[PDB]
Structures are given as structure tokens and as C-alpha cells.
Design an enzyme around this catalytic site. Structure first.
Site: not given
Ligand code: NAD
Ligand code: NAD
Ligand code: NAD
Ligand code: NAD
Lengths: 423, 431, 431, 428
Positions: D167-168, D306-307, D270, D187, D275
Site C-alpha cells: 500500500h505505502i 514513530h510519526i 521512524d 517483493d 519504543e
Molecule cells: N511508521 C509508521 O507509522 C507506519 C505506518 C503504517 C504502516 N507501517 C508499517 O509499514 C509496513 C508497510 O505497510 P503497508 O500497509 O504498505 O503494508 P502491506 O501489507 O500493504 O505491504 C507490504 C508488502 O511487503 C511485501 N513483503 C512482505 N514480506 C517481504 C519480504 N520479506 N521481502 C520483501 N517484500 C516483502 C508484501 O508482499 C507486500 O507487498 C508494515 O509493516 C506497516 O506496519 C508503519
């Protein structure tokens, strides 16, 4: 991972496809292990009644009439595929009363109609149709007067639905400004702008295109007042419904040099079959007059007549019939409760899916869940549509012996219309 | 980036030793040119057709600039009488109707509009890609004669198909962008490597384009290398049921081979805007076997779009032609600017600031032989030359100079001295 | 579209009666400049700092081209000793460190790199828009001192906000496309009507931009009209919690007013790259109250980003400067091309075809007085002037001429004659 | 495109006033949405002590929490009227989901509402690291003027390495290209690229060819410390590491070494292995993470608390998403998107469908339950019914057609007397 389901009893599934459905449907059906009979044309009632008595699914198009007369003989028919938009050729109420789900492809022609209009905007703006008819008869007539680059002109889209919205993006890509009128507020795509009234669209458009349904409010919605509201030398394109334009008024506005060109794909009366003499004054009184006008493009309702369109029609409707047969899925059916469940994980063995079509009367679920009470109901979904209703249930630990018993009990219930069990 | 330049007003210049400028426009030039010419204070004579040689010879003796199109032939026979003719405007692409070498030898610059038809031809091909893909021409001819024939077999959505563009120039590159917007893949072959627009891809060989394309479009000049460059072998390299579009030059396609590929069901449709032989005027019965032996056969084939060379026949195209060439002629008359001339050294100078009073611009066309600038800068030695630029094109050369502190008395003297020089071809002074 | 330009290869030119070219590069110009010069066969002396006046006068007496930046002062005192100096390259924007008038009177063309930092400043502002919107500067300062402060209050997604660009020039227009790409609405005020890029909108008055903007960024020159154009009145017209970014000039923002608007919670954050007074060298304690009275107060404020005028401080920017100025000097040395010079008539000619043998290019810098071209074209009268262009800039003027069929013997005579003329400032011949 | 009978809003059968408890400073959009139904809302900016929470949760119908509030069996056992739990964040580990389910309590979250905020954050930090803006500003705030162009970069022409193209990551891709980045992504699955990004077969190819490496992967055993020395050694000299995913994905000791050895030119972190639970000074130190004081000493490292999702827009979207979910679960049967519960829903009823009642039956997933229920409802027409099971619990939604006030109380008591009942609600 998915769990492929089989139908208790029945033997191989028989599909009858009429009127030349695209081969993509034939491939899908064969890949299901079905036995497919294919015909390029429709069938006379005698041949159709004979072929339909033992057929499980029938695929038709516009001409084949599946009335009560022919459906009463349909002993094994589970569902009907209409590989087109219209369902009028099918007695939907009767089909429903016997538990026969009907499917269509409503929006599969969107791209084809949109590309058609782009081509006709350009042809009308450049008078290609006339020029080519002229050279095919020896006349050399290089004309730049009142022939236009389409870039910079304004397209007026009447009806901003599936076709209108796709036409919108194509028109802007060709450099057109897009204004659209619709009886509902719709979020514009790209840089299109919705206008409050039809007259504003008519006053400000160089090209006026119709993409509206057939309703009392669309009946002749473009007539003498609306043509008078258009720009001098503007263009009318109608690939929607044959009732939306008042053709005598269009002939007048064209003959009066008010409308510079028109492209008509639909007509108040259209032939039932292709033929050389079919388009004439007996079919539409103004035909010989319409044919005499310059810069009118006339097409035999080919708005969706492309390989791709038929190929998409094939896939949608064949996949739909396939999911209804193999799973039970009735979503998108035009006469039937829309019911479905998530497929089985393959490892969930000894699980059976009950497909129970019945009358929408109280107590039926009482009866059915009694019959199923010795097994765990993992999932169940029942919905109603008029006098009929449809129940899907997934039951957990069922062996070969108790399928015959569960089936025979359900087959004996008073409200039953149709029952199938899926392994 | 585009901004209203807020600098010093320019010093509009007027020609010395002349009366009002007389413009002759032939063959129904667009109204945009007439407006521009009138706004210059010029006297404009307008004709919808050309002129016979006799009537044209008399009319041109006192004309300063002539505007023509394709049909008017300005040969040495008629140009000999042009005592006052400063420049020739061709409000079209072709300049063959003008004796460019002779016009140059008498100091007459010629201008044309080479690329003003790009958009119109590009949209033409888009409409024809769609028309051929949907068989619109045939269906509509059928209904005008009573025949109802709904056909979807081998009629195509254009989205997902491949356009083969041969010649990726002004029209081709613009056709490329339109084609992708309609959803086509674009391949292009050209004898030069060109940076692709959008996601188009250039192919190394013509046959690769022919093998991989669903629609083949020609946008090439007329050269010995393009003569019948699509013939029987190239049709054989194309896809079964592919489409051929030629809105370029009438020699580039071998029509007998095209007719054969169509009759052999190899080519599914074709759109032709240009032809080996074309009528000189519009009329009935003009397009037949006497003009092209294979016409009656070509006309009998299904799904062929034939157009009477209307690739640039739009109000917009003619409007741009009017503006481009009229501006060109106007800037050459009023300023000296010969940039873009087809027969003439390309020479220009930055305009002079309003407050550069008593400054005169010398426009000196002369023979490209040594010693001329020695003479001219001698004659101009009592004044400061602000700017000077001289360039040569074959046997003629053209000198623009801005000289300051010049009064009315000194204009007549500078003029006749320069007018008396041995190397002079034509002299104008701008005050 | 871009094409493989199919013309005759050029005839590389070498100066007559001169040896190897001596290039002096000071102040650590990027290596791209050294590479270009060495590839020309030039002799390059490189220094990381400038030179003391004594060492500079001695080293400049035999140097043909000098490259400097901001610190090297090329005054009349040191330039009077430059016998062979043809041109000066300023590998920066500013030219005030060069006596442009004196250099011009001695025939020394000066070039600079005015716009090479545009991309770098635009990216800087994008990064700061986000940093101010998210309070990144503070959050990271906080954890580096142990404080954990996760804050979402008043921190913004930048998508959907409105960027107010003041000055829609080289940087502003590039900032515009980046901002929209980041999802910003772009408004711009400028003293000129400028066609907007993308979907940006120009506003009639500065206050409309201030009222409607979430981020206000300044990209204006230093003029009396831009000095302190954002002060207390302008802050009062901005939105509550709006943001100010100044990567333009140190005079354009009234810092006491900004500090005032921040302390009143009117302005939510600020990013400053330029300042009224700046240190001469990098070092600690250099940015303090002695430099600017309000410094200690400015640093006490939340969510203010301070940068040491790093708007153009990227490898790429310095590399583009290297390419721009070295190419400019190289074309002026090898071809006479003075287009883009800051103190000199802008003159150039199309290069000559490799095959045009015995063709010579005369480069004649001289006094802008009448009769000089008389003299020069006299001296050249035995040869055909193929092309000639002369333009004037104040008291000097510059003559380029390509003359045909010239042998080794008669080049020395043409040179010595031109070298003897009364109006001569500088003469070079290219063979 | 988006385009403009009204539904029959349902009210729970003979119950009291609805009580909502919102903790941890949920956005006002959630408060506004709840009040517009007439609910009673108690709002708190911080979490609650375990004592004050147990008293307050006994009479609350819906609770909104975030990451810090731990709803364990200890506290949920006292939840007499709790129908559902809203997690206004991504993580749900702070709730004992199974216990909540066994008592018929649906739990909802906002999994993807922070995508835009993390993506823009990385853009800012790509630029900040490429220019070492963080350092420059810290320097001037302490008097040091240090104009540096050496090894500072225009971001245009560089390569962004996105690890985890979800997603991100996918949203970051379009922004990165718009900023002039070339985008490579690794990926474990083949994913259709957005714009002109190109997937690379191996992680090492991404590390070798990227200038900026960003992590957007879930926290799994396969991502645990997935970037360590062997990876840093595979990256380009002077490359940049950005981690806004989960605090376990980067081996921080190896990163500190790679920074100290001038191999990695900068990093933006982040998330962290450990934490703080609340904001405060001195919370980020060697006692929290052994390497903290050493990490802080390094040049060109951006550290954020963690923002990644700390924006008004993100919190507003979270507010809207979860409050809508809880409201639709309360006002309707809709449990779609719940993290511990059968996902069940039905099309709402037309205003004109009078005397129609909606049965919401939480129960144990054992045979015979539906037999019982459709018996109880057999005197009325079942218009629609849907039941699905999730482990040991199951959930039945049914619409019955001709029911009067007398017949609702009886239907309620019968269903309330069933053996398999976990929770029963009727919507009238
Ligand atoms: N810093 C923050 O405040 C914050 C906010 C939102 C999300 N996040 C974190 O960021 C991450 C990404 O979030 P998202 O919603 O985009 O996730 P998501 O589930 O939409 O996508 C994650 C992607 O990583 C891939 N992936 C999984 N294991 C892998 C590996 N070993 N090697 C390569 N690719 C791999 C998956 O196939 C998927 O395409 C999550 O861990 C989430 O918890 C952090
Ligand atoms: N020529 C062909 O072969 C062909 C092929 C496909 C569809 N069609 C016809 O074209 C039409 C458009 O199809 P679609 O899938 O885009 O339809 P759609 O249902 O997706 O959209 C039609 C739009 O028209 C609007 N509308 C309805 N009544 C209106 C009125 N009185 N005035 C203005 N706007 C009004 C609706 O709001 C809607 O947005 C239909 O009638 C369809 O049957 C023709
Ligand atoms: N039908 C009409 O009314 C009409 C109107 C305008 C122009 N045209 C004609 O269309 C043609 C294209 O016009 P344009 O302005 O785009 O031309 P152009 O000069 O811009 O481009 C022509 C391209 O063809 C390429 N080319 C040349 N020889 C080639 C060869 N042998 N094989 C492949 N590529 C080759 C060139 O490299 C160039 O890129 C011209 O011949 C012009 O006269 C027709
Ligand atoms: N911070 C840095 O390191 C750095 C680097 C490069 C350039 N700059 C500075 O940034 C500024 C912008 O550079 P540029 O190349 O974009 O300039 P530019 O010449 O391309 O554009 C400046 C714009 O400001 C407009 N303008 C002038 N006066 C104005 C006024 N009073 N109000 C509003 N608009 C006005 C002009 O019309 C023009 O559009 C210059 O001052 C330059 O020195 C700073």
C-alpha cells in the site's frame, strides 16, 4: 487455494450455445469438462425444443426467444446465458418460477461504443464518409470549408455513464473540451465539466453525443427545440437508443443547414435480420429522405460489434454461468436472488454445499436447517426475490452415504423448486 | 516560463522611397492573411482563383508581394516583369510552382508553410484507423442503399492494437501521441534515430515494423528511396488482416500490389488520401481509369477509404497557413527578416528600441563576390554601424545593417550610392 | 522530437600565431570543467582556493582563460596585467566580483551560470514544505536529546494544501510542477503575466496569494521592490498557522516580523536559507547575535528550519555549472561564440563544414566608432566574405567574419594589418 | 464514476442510551460521527489507569482505543454491555481478540489509513538526507555555519529502492518518479508496477543499483532484521537507508557500523525495536535501546518518534473509518472488516418495509443452532438470512417480515433462552 466442487449425480454438464457466442465462451465451458453444442444461428422452435429437453445451460443472444412455450420442456436447465445486454427475449418471471437463473453482459460494449464515437466525431468533422462515397463513384471533391480539426472543439455528452465516462477521457485525449448533462450529479473524469441544463450543453457544444437509457424522459429528447438550441453547424451522434432522437426533426435541422452532420447507429425500427432490402421507407417512412442528406453516417447498430466486445461478453457470461453451476453464485443475475459464498480451501474435506431454490414462504428454513441439523453449518446465506428465494449452505462432515439422505430429504420438501448438491 | 516581455517598445520601421505596399493574393488565401496584411497598412488585392498568364503579367509589374498556393506557376517568364516584387508567399507546402533560383537571382525571397498540416493529417489517420477497424465506410454505404449488415467479425476495438508509423517526423510524432491516447502501441521506423514520444518504440528495420503492426501508416517525404516502398514484398511481411494507411505521397504505395494483397485477403483494409495521379480541379468523373488505370478495380474492393487529398483540408490548417506565411512576408517586408526562406540567405537582426531615433536599417541584396562589403561599409562610414549581419546562399548574399544618426537628407544619398553599386541586386532602406 | 542531426561534421578551429591554451581555474570549480578543458587540448592549472593579489597578478599575465567563483576579485588592478586573457568564466551566478566594464574595454568576454541552481532550490523547497508540515526538524532534534514526542496535532499531509509561489521564474515554475506532483494547489504572484505550468493559477494581487496559501515561498530577485516584501502587514494577511519558506535573497523577509508572527502563533513554521548577514567562512559560533541581532531569538522558536545558504549546494548543480561555463568559454575560444556573455556583444555564426578548407574566421573586437568596418572589409577585400556579423555593446563592438580561400602566407598579412588598425581592441584568427 | 429509497434506520430493541468511550485522543471526526447518532460520548486525550478503566468500561457500549490501551481479559471480563471495540490504529495486539470474540465483542481497526502520510514522509526524508538538511539546521541552531555541497545530491536521476511494494510502497512509487527518481522494487511476489517502476528479481540487485533504500514490509520472521551487514555491504558507497515500517526490520548495530565506516551516507528511522509507551523527555536513551547514545552521535541520521501516520488527515481518515465501522455494526449488523469476528452483513431495508425486524444472533459454532433459530422464527417470513462462523463462534443475521410489538419481546426471550447463545440483539 481453492476447492473445485462437483454436482451430486447429473453426469456431464450439457451447454447449448446459439447465435454464435464468441469462442472464448466455448473454451471456458470445455475447460470445465462440459459438453458444448455450438450453433452459428438461432434455431427453429422444433429443433430448439428437442435440443433443450436435456440441456443444463443455454447461451443465447438477441434473436432467440426463450418463452414459457420452450422453457416448459427444459427438464435439466439450471441457468440461461444471454450473451448480450437485453433480456427481453427471455420470460424472466417464468424462468425464475422454475428456478432457472438468467445472466447477461450489460456493460461489455462500453469501449466499443466510445471508440466508435471518436471515429465518427472525426469523420463528421472532416466529411470522410462523403469524400469516400464520392471517390468510389469518380467524384473528386477536396473540401476544406467547414471541415474541422477536432482539437479545440467541445463535445457534449448526454448521459455520463459507462460509455459517456469512457468517451470523456478519449475525447480530452483527442484535444476536445468535454461538457456533460445528466439527470444525476456525477464526479467528472479528467477535466470534464457537468452543466446544469441540457440547453447549456446544446448551446456550448460543437459535437452532441447521446448515451442515455430508453425511458419516457429520453423519448425524443432531442427534437426541433433542442436542435434550435444547438450551434449553427454542430453535429449529432446517437449510438444509444433508437427512440432518443426525433429523426424528422433531425432531417429538418440538417436540411436547414442548422446541423452540419449526424451519425446514427440506432433507429426507431430496425430489421430483425441482416438483408439487402431491410432498410427502407416501409421500415422507417423517412428513410429515403434521411439517405439523401449530406454528411450523415449510418451504421446498422454496430456500436458493440467488435471481436473484443464479443470476447468480453463471452468471458463475463461464461464465467458467470460457470460460477453458478460450479459454485452456486447468482450475483449479477437479472431475475434471481443474488447469493454467493467464499470458496472452500480444498483442505476442508467432507464439506458439501447445498443449493436450495424454493418458494419464499415461512418455515422453509425451519425445514431445511432441521434436515441439516446433524451437521455443522459452516456458512449459510438465503435471500428472496419476489415469490422465490435461494439458500446456499456449507456443511462440514458429510460422507457419501449421507449425501443421498440429505439430498432425498430436501428433494421431498413442500417448498422445493430446485435442489443441487455440490461435493 | 512564457511571459509578457516587459521591455522597451520596438521601433516600427517604414520603407524609404516607396509608396503604399501592394499585395496580390491568389487562389483564395485564408482570411487570416488578409487581416494581417491590412493591419500592416498594405493594399491587398484578393482573388479566389489563379490568373491567366496574360492578366497576371500586367498585374505583377507594380506588385510588392505576391501570395499564391499550389496552382499558380511563377516562372521566369512572368517574374521578369516584377519590377517592385519584394517577396513571394506560398500559402502551402510546395514551392515547385516558383522558379526559386531565378527569384533569388533578382533578390526575391520565397516563404512557405511546410508543417502547418501536421495536426489535421494526424487526426485524419486516427479517424481512419477507427473507421477501417470498424468498417464504417462499408456499413454506411450499405445503409444508404438499403442494406442492413451488422458485422462484428474481424471488426476491432483499436485499443491494444499496434500502430506502425513509417516516418516519425512532424506528422508521425504527433500521430504517435494521439495513437497511444487511443490505446495503441506505437512502433516507428525511420532512417534516422529519433527520441520516441511517450512510450513509442523505434524498430531497426522496416520488416520488423511490418511483422508486428496491425495498422501501418506512411508519413515519409517523396524520395527515390520511398518510391513504391510498400509493395508486394512488404505486404507479404505484414500481418494477415492488417491495415494500410497512406496520407503521405502518392508514389509511396504500389497500388497494384495493394489491390492484390486486398484481393488475397492479406490486407483487411486501406485508407488512401494521395494517389500517383490526381485531378487538378474538383469535378465529377475526375477520378477514374484514365487518371489511374487501376481505379475501377480499387473502387470495387471492400473496406477501402478513399479521400481526395484532404489530409490538410481543415479550417484550422488553412488558418495557420494564412497566419504563418503572412507573418513571414510581413516581417521580411517591414523588418528584413528572411529566416525560414526557401531560396534565400537566412538573415535577421533584433528590433530597434523606440528611442533609437534617426536610426536606419539597410537591406542590401547583392552578388556573392569579394569587395562588396568594402564598398558598402565605405558608403556607410560617416555613420556608426550599430549592428551588421551578412550571409550568402549560392551566388547571392544579403546584408542587414543598422546605422545611427541619419537625417532625411542623408537617406536619399545613402540610397542612391548603394543603388549605384556594381554588386547590387535589390536595395531597400527602412526608416 | 530529438534527432540525429545529419549534417557535415564541423571543422575544428585552432588560433593563429598562438600556442597551447592556458586555463586557470580557481576556487574549486567542478571536475566537469577540468575534463572539458583538457579534452580541448588546453593546459589547465587548478586551485581549490582563490589566489592572493600578488600571486594572481603574476599568474594571470600569461593565462588565456580564467575560471573563478564568488571570492576572486578581478578588478582593473589585476586585469590590467592580463596580456593574453580572452575570456573570464564565473562558475556561479554573481558577476559583481569582476569589473565588467573594464574587462569589456580590453576585449575580455565574461560568462556565468545564472540558472544552474534552479532544480536544486526547487527540491529544497519541496523537502522543506514536507518538513515544516510534519515538524521533522523538531522531532529529530528532540530524539537526539532523548525526548520522545509523537505529535500529530497541526502536522499535515501536504496533499491538498495550497502553495503560494512568489516569483514564477526559473525556480518557481520548476517548484510548481513538483508541488502539484506532491498534490499541492499552486498559486503564484508575479509582477509579470506568465503562462502557468500544469494547472497552476496566477493571482492578481499578493494579498490574494497570502490569504489563500498554506505555504508561501519566495523566488524573486533582489530589487528595491522585493526588499522586505514580506513583513508584519504581509504576515497579517496570511492564514493562521501558515508557513514561510525563503530560499531567495536575505533581504526579502523581515526576520523580526517573522519571529513576531511565529511568537503570536500566526505563522506555524518557517524555512530560511538566506539571511541579511552571512558568515564569510564555515565555522562554529559564526551564526550568532553579532551577525544578526535576532539570531538567538530565532533559534529559540519552534519548527524553524535554518540552512546555510545551501539552495544550490548539490553535486549536480556544481556539475551543471562546470558544463555550462566550460562549454561557454570553450565555444568562445574555439569558435568566437559570445552568446550568453554578460558584458559583451552577443555574436556567433554557424560553424564551417570540415571540407571548407582554406576558410578562416576573423575575430575582431574593437571600439564602437564609425568607419571600423570600412577598414576591416577593406583589409579583407581580396577574399570572399562568406558570412559576417558585427554587434555593438556600449563602447565596444565585435566582428565575426568567415572568409574563403585563404592560404598560410596571406593569413599573416591579414592578421598583421588588422593588428595595426587604430580601432583594434583584440584580434584572433581561427584556421 | 462517483454519482449522487432512503434506508430505514434501525434502533436496537428496547435498550437504553448508547455509551461510547473514546481514549487516547481520537480525532474529532469520530466524536462528531458518534454524536450525530445521539450517542453519549466520553472523550479522553490519554489512556486510563487500569482502576479507572475497569469502572468506566462496565457500562460502556462501544470503546475506541489506540496502541497503548491494553484491553485484556482482566478488563474485558467487567464489560457488561460492550458490543464492539474500535482500534483507531493499525495494531490490535493490545486487545485479547479471542477473549473478546468468545463474549461476542467485534473488534475493528484502520489498517491502511496512513499510506499517504508515510509516503510523503519518505519523500521529505529522501530530500533531507540527500541534502543533510537535518544536520545543517541543528548546526545553525547552535551557531555553526557549514555550507556543504560535497556528497549532497539533487534527488532527480537517483534510484529509489522500495523493499515491500504494498500500500505505502506503491503509493511512494508514483511520488518518487514525479520527483525524478528511478524506482526499483523487490517483493516476494510479482506485482504490477505503477507508472514506470520496474521490479527486480533479487534483493541484492535492488541493493546494488539503488541510491535510496526504503522498507515497507510487514513484521514477519522473514523480515526480522532483513537488512544487516551482508545487505549494507551490497549497497552502494554513500547510499541511504530509510525505515518507516516496523522497528525489527533493520539491524541497528550493523547500520551504525555501516554509517561509522562511511559506507552508508545517511539514514532516516521512524520505528525502533523498543519504543516508549508515552511521550516524555529522557524516554529515548541507552536504557530503552543500548545503542541509542551512539546512534545519536552519527552524522546525517534522521530520527522520528514513530510519526509516519501522525497527520491530521491520517487521524481524520482513521476517525472516519473506525467510527463508521463501529456505528454500522451497532446500527446495523455489519461486521465486515472486523479482525476477530465473522464478517457478515446484509443490504439495509427500505423505509417502506414496515414491521420488519433484524435478528443479530451471536452463538457457538456447533450443529443444530440454525435448526433452533429458524424454528423460533418460523411463524414469520425470513426475507434474508446470512450466518458465518469464525473458529468457535458464529454469527447469524436475519431479516423477518411481519412482526408487531407483541411478537418482538417473545422472539427476544426465546432467542435469549437458547443454549448456544453468546449475544442477541434485535433491530426494530
Ligand atoms: N511508521 C509508521 O507509522 C507506519 C505506518 C503504517 C504502516 N507501517 C508499517 O509499514 C509496513 C508497510 O505497510 P503497508 O500497509 O504498505 O503494508 P502491506 O501489507 O500493504 O505491504 C507490504 C508488502 O511487503 C511485501 N513483503 C512482505 N514480506 C517481504 C519480504 N520479506 N521481502 C520483501 N517484500 C516483502 C508484501 O508482499 C507486500 O507487498 C508494515 O509493516 C506497516 O506496519 C508503519
Ligand atoms: N449502440 C450500441 O450498440 C450500444 C451498445 C451499448 C450500449 N448502448 C446503449 O447506450 C446507452 C448508454 O449505455 P451505458 O452502459 O453507458 O449506460 P449507463 O446506465 O451506464 O449510463 C446512462 C447514463 O444516462 C443518464 N441519464 C438517464 N436518463 C437521462 C436523461 N433523461 N437525460 C440525461 N441523462 C440521463 C444516467 O444518469 C446515466 O449516467 C444505453 O441506452 C445502452 O443501452 C448501445
Ligand atoms: N495528405 C496531405 O494532405 C498532406 C499534408 C501535409 C503533409 N503531407 C505529406 O506527408 C509527409 C510527412 O510530412 P511531415 O511534415 O510529417 O514530414 P517530415 O519531414 O516532418 O518527416 C518525414 C520523416 O520521414 C523520415 N524518412 C525519410 N525518408 C525515409 C525513408 N526512406 N524511410 C523511412 N523514413 C524516412 C524522415 O527521417 C522524417 O522523420 C510529407 O511527404 C508531406 O508532403 C501530406
Ligand atoms: N538559495 C540559493 O542558494 C539560491 C540559488 C539560486 C538562486 N537563488 C535566488 O533565487 C531567486 C530566484 O532565481 P530564479 O533564477 O528563479 O529567478 P528568475 O529571474 O528566473 O525569476 C524571478 C521571478 O521573480 C519575479 N519578480 C520580480 N520582482 C517581483 C516582485 N516584486 N514580486 C513578485 N515577483 C517578482 C520575476 O518576474 C521572475 O518571474 C534569485 O534571487 C536567485 O538569486 C538562490
Amino acid at each position: 487455494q481453492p476447492k473445485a466442487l462437483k454436482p451430486f449425480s447429473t453426469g456431464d454438464m450439457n451447454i447449448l450455445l446459439l447465435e454464435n457466442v464468441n469462442a472464448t465462451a466455448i473454451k471456458i465451458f470445455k475447460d470445465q469438462g462440459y459438453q458444448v453444442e455450438f450453433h452459428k444461428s438461432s434455431l427453429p422452435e422444433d429443433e430448439l425444443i428437442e435440443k433443450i429437453k436435456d440441456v443444463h445451460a443455454i447461451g443465447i443472444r438477441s434473436k432467440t426467444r426463450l418463452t414459457e412455450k420452450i422453457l416448459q420442456h427444459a427438464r435439466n436447465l439450471v441457468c440461461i446465458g444471454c450473451f448480450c445486454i437485453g433480456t427481453n427475449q427471455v420470460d424472466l418471471k417464468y424462468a425464475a418460477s422454475k428456478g432457472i437463473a438468467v445472466f447477461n453482459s450489460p456493460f461489455s460494449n462500453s469501449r466499443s461504443v466510445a471508440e466508435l464515437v471518436i471515429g465518427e466525431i472525426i469523420s463528421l468533422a472532416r466529411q470522410l464518409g462523403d469524400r469516400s462515397i464520392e471517390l468510389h463513384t469518380g467524384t473528386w471533391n477536396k473540401v476544406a470549408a467547414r471541415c474541422w480539426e477536432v482539437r479545440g472543439k467541445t463535445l457534449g455528452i448526454i448521459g455520463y455513464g459507462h460509455i459517456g465516462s469512457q468517451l470523456s477521457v478519449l475525447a480530452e485525449a483527442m484535444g476536445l473540451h468535454v461538457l456533460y448533462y445528466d439527470i444525476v450529479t456525477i464526479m467528472a473524469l479528467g477535466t470534464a465539466r457537468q452543466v446544469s441544463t441540457l440547453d447549456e450543453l446544446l448551446n456550448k457544444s460543437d459535437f452532441v453525443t447521446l448515451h442515455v437509457p430508453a425511458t419516457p424522459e429520453t423519448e425524443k429528447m432531442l427534437s426541433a427545440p433542442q436542435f434550435a438550441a444547438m450551434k449553427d453547424g454542430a453535429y449529432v451522434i446517437n449510438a444509444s437508443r433508437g427512440t432518443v432522437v426525433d429523426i424528422p426533426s433531425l432531417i429538418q435541422a440538417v436540411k436547414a443547414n442548422k446541423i452540419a452532420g449526424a451519425a446514427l447507429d440506432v433507429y426507431p425500427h430496425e430489421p430483425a435480420k441482416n438483408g439487402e432490402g431491410s432498410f427502407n421507407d416501409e421500415l422507417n417512412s423517412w428513410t429515403s429522405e434521411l439517405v439523401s442528406l449530406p454528411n450523415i453516417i449510418l451504421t446498422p447498430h454496430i456500436g458493440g460489434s467488435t471481436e473484443e466486445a464479443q470476447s468480453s461478453i463471452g468471458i463475463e457470461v461464461a464465467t458467470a454461468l460457470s460460477k453458478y453451476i460450479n459454485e452456486g453464485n447468482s450475483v449479477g443475475s437479472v431475475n434471481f436472488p443474488e447469493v454467493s459464498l467464499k470458496s472452500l480451501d480444498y483442505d476442508q474435506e467432507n464439506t458439501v454445499r447445498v443449493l436450495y431454490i424454493h418458494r419464499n414462504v415461512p418455515g422453509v428454513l425451519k425445514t431445511v436447517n432441521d434436515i441439516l441439523s446433524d451437521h455443522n453449518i459452516e456458512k449459510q446465506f438465503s435471500d428472496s426475490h419476489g415469490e422465490i428465494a435461494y439458500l446456499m449452505a456449507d456443511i462440514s462432515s458429510v460422507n457419501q452415504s449421507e449425501i443421498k439422505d440429505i439430498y432425498e430429504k430436501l428433494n421431498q420438501t413442500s417448498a422445493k423448486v430446485s435442489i443441487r448438491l455440490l461435493y
